[PDB]
Amino acid sequence: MNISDVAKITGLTSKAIRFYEEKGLVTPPMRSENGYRTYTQQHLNELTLLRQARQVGFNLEESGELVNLFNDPQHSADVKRRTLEKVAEIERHIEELQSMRDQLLALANACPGDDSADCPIIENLS
């Protein structure tokens, strides 16, 4: 498979794919007779893991580490640890959003909601 095939299959652009290689986040593909990158199923799995990990919350570095763990013959407990930590991270984010949502709704309920200039929302946000 050439880089265009991988882009189509993974949904990643060829630039993003070259980027992942450039940052050593994935295994470097070998070169064909004419010098073009040749990809294997392993590359597809690494790029998929990278794309999906990101989509579910892991950042670049974290995603790169998951790829590292993936290629390792040997870490169920470890990956679980990383995953549960991601969950805790997301829950704190959910908690913060919920808090801001409730603060806005408390202010909104206090708002005259009319043509008067008096506004608790603006006054308490500034």
Q: Which residues are annotated as a binding site for Cu(+)?
A: 111, 119
Taking only Cα atoms into account, the Rg of the chain, rounded to an integer number of angstroms, comes to 23
Cβ neighbour number for residue 13 with a 10 Å cutoff: 11
List 8, 15, 31, 80, residue binding its own copies (CB under 8 A): 80
Instruction: Please list every residue from 3 through 32 that binds its own copies, using CB under 8 A.
Output: none
Q: Is 118 in the site for its own copies (CB under 8 A)?
A: yes
- Among residues 78, 35, 88, the alpha carbon closest in space to that of 57 is found at 88
Dist. CA 124–CA 12, nearest whole Å: 44
Dist. CA 74–CA 49, nearest whole Å: 17
Kindly list the residues in this chain that would bind its own copies in the complex (CB under 8 A): 45-46, 48-49, 52-53, 55-57, 66, 69-70, 72-77, 79-80, 83-84, 86-87, 90-91, 93-94, 97-98, 100-101, 103-105, 107-108, 111-119, 121-122, 125-126
